[PDB]
Amino acid sequence: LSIPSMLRQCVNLHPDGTAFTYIDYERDSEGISESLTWSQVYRRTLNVAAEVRRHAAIGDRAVILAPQGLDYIVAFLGALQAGLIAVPLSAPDERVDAVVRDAKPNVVLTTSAIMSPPTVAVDQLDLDSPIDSLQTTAYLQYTTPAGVMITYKNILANFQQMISAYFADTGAVPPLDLFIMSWLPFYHDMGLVLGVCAPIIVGCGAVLTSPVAFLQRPARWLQLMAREGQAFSAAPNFAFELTAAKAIDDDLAGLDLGRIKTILCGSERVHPATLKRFVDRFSRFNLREFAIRPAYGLAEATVYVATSQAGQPPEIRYFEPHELSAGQAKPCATGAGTALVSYPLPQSPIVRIVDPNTNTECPPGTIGEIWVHGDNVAGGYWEKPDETERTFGGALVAPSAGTPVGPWLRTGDSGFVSEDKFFIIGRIKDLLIVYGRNHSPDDIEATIQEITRGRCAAIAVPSNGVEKLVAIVELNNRDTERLSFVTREVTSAISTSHGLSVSDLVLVAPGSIPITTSGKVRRAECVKLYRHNEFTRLD
Ligand SMILES: Nc1ncnc2c1ncn2[C@@H]1O[C@H](COP(=O)(O)OP(=O)(O)NP(=O)(O)O)[C@@H](O)[C@H]1O
Numbered sequence: 291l292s293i294p295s296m297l298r299q300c301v302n303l304h305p306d307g308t309a310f311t312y313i314d315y316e317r318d319s320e321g322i323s324e325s326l327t328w329s330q331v332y333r334r335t336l337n338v339a340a341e342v343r344r345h346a347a348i349g350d351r352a353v354i355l356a357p358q359g360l361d362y363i364v365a366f367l368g369a370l371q372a373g374l375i376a377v378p379l380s381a382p383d384e385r386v387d388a389v390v391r392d393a394k395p396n397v398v399l400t401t402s403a404i405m406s407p408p409t410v411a412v413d414q415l416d417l418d419s420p421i422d423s424l425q426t427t428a429y430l431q432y433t434t435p436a437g438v439m440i441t442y443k444n445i446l447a448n449f450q451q452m453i454s455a456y457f458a459d460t461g462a463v464p465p466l467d468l469f470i471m472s473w474l475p476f477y478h479d480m481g482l483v484l485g486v487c488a489p490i491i492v493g494c495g496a497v498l499t500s501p502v503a504f505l506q507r508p509a510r511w512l513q514l515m516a517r518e519g520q521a522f523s524a525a526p527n528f529a530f531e532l533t534a535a536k537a538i539d540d541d542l543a544g545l546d547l548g549r550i551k552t553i554l555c556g557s558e559r560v561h562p563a564t565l566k567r568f569v570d571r572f573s574r575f576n577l578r579e580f581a582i583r584p585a586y587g588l589a590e591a592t593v594y595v596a597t598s599q600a601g602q603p604p605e606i607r608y609f610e611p612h613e614l615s616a617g618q619a620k621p622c623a624t625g626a627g628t629a630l631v632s633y634p635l636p637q638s639p640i641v642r643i644v645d646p647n648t649n650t651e652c653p654p655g656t657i658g659e660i661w662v663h664g665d666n667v668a669g670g671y672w673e674k675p676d677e678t679e680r681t682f683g684g685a686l687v688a689p690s691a692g693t694p695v696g697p698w699l700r701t702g703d704s705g706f707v708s709e710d711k712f713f714i715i716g717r718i719k720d721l722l723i724v725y726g727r728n729h730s731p732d733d734i735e736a737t738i739q740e741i742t743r744g745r746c747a748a749i750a751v752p753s754n755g756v757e758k759l760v761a762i763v764e765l766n767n768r769d770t771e772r773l774s775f776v777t778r779e780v781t782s783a784i785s786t787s788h789g790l791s792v793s794d795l796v797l798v799a800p801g802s803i804p805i806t807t808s809g810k811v812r813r814a815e816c817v818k819l820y821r822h823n824e825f826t827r828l829d
């Protein structure tokens with residue numbers, strides 16, 4: 291039924307089986323491993339549960355403000371065990387403070403190394419001392435801050451959808467020696483569902499580390515995935531880029547990547563050229579290319595919406611770019627126009643492309659907003675009726691045959707269907723509209739990112755009633771001419787490959803463009819930093 295009861299059943303079936311292994315790289319750059327069997331993580335969970343029942347009642351929120359590691363896991367699991375709504379946050383910002391005010395927690399779970407409601411340092415609890423839950427709301431997944439309410443029903447449904455789609459070629463049964471491997475942060479939906487929940491729900495073990503460790507030496511990702519068994523992992527697109535760029539072959543001495551079962555690529559636009567570099571670079575170590583699975587979803591859907599066909603490598607389709615910017619997907623020849631990853635229309639949940647101004651499905655090939663319906667779709671945002679209604683209350687006008695009327699999750703993403711596959715253009719609010727045509731930041735950035743090889747951000751800045759293109763461009767500092775080579779180069783490439791004039795090319799130092807913990811650009815941030823003149827230009 292719930293995560294706590296599934297955790298207890300893991301304990302009955304395999305008390306001494308390994309459950310969680312955390313590889314810490316902070317003191318020893320080669321890694322220090324610490325591991326918990328099912329019994330051991332259950333004991334700690336129960337001790338955390340008892341400490342938390344002293345400060346808070348069933349139904350209260352419990353904020354988790356710990357660094358990545360084993361204590362985070364038993365803080366979250368212990369909150370669920372005691373019937374609290376867990377609120378996974380990062381370790382200290384201002385967001386953290388606004389989430390606490392929104393969630394009004396009756397307890398905080400933290401660690402001594404970082405410090406009204408009672409704060410608990412779970413590492414200073416006697417967690418291994420020897421020796422209830424809700425059936426509905428498990429935790430709030432925070433993005434003004436809005437916390438997605440995730441129920442056990444949401445979780446169970448997405449896992450049925452995920453296990454069915456990911457393991458369709460083996461009859462929805464994962465292999466006996468599957469293990470999970472993740473460096474994604476536990477306070478993001480991908481990292482929480484994969485790293486903390488999935489080991490319990492699937493009945494497999496997890497090998498875990500921090501996003502900070504991965505960004506230091508991206509080879510550690512490949513190394514830990516190559517451990518004994520068939521690895522299941524996930525990462526954003528540019529983490530594929532980074533690993534392809536920074537890993538050294540001697541770090542990969544005698545690594546066998548041919549047992550890796552799945553690496554999801556999701557949480558941002560999946561670029562075929564990144565995927566091609568990753569497979570070209572690492573096919574030498576037997577990385578099977580059917581192991582790579584583009585995956586689309588969002589926190590409002592718990593995590594999963596759609597993925598590539600199991601047992602095949604990613605499928606790429608090509609469309610006319612000018613037609614795309616005009617709102618129409620016109621297929622073209624392999625290598626022409628713009629390339630997009632094919633996503634098979636999922637069986638569960640279901641996807642529709644919908645005109646956001648008329649609440650009516652688009653004809654195939656017409657670009658509109660991606661709408662989602664299914665039991666994995668959350669019931670709303672915590673204590674936000676109005677915003678819940680705006681985001682979760684999609685109602686279809688004159689639904690097509692078999693298509694439910696509602697309620698539909700409005701994803702905020704632009705996309706289209708072609709040949710019973712759908713494609714994702716990008717986030718609507720990040721699109722650059724010039725002369726009635728929509729252009730995608732992800733495509734412009736690829737254009738720049740090939741000449742720069744540094745990071746990018748293509749943003750729209752309103753001025754006197756139109757949108758102007760501005761490009762924040764990271765670049766390596768270690769003369770005045772090359773700088774004007776790059777300016778000339780990037781400006782022309784955008785013009786020749788997009789028909790756009792760049793109003794402003796902001797050449798900055800590496801690390802000036804804001805990025806996620808997983809490393810993804812923040813485009814709405816980039817905008818008002820530009821608008822409040824907060825960027826320093828290499829001139
Ligand atoms: N496979 C994918 N392809 C394209 N876009 C994706 C994919 N997976 C996730 N996304 C995008 O990430 C969004 C949800 O990520 P979420 O964590 O819920 O908020 P976010 O961090 O603001 N992501 P984003 O702004 O898109 O980079 C989805 O709406 C998509 O915009």
Ligand SMILES: CCCCCCCCCCCCCCCC(=O)O
Nearest residue numbers: 483484488556557585586587588589
């Ligand atoms: C076998 C267990 C599978 C566990 C998978 C959990 C992670 C699933 C990720 C699916 C796509 C994620 C994209 C949505 C996240 C986001 O963008 O906010």
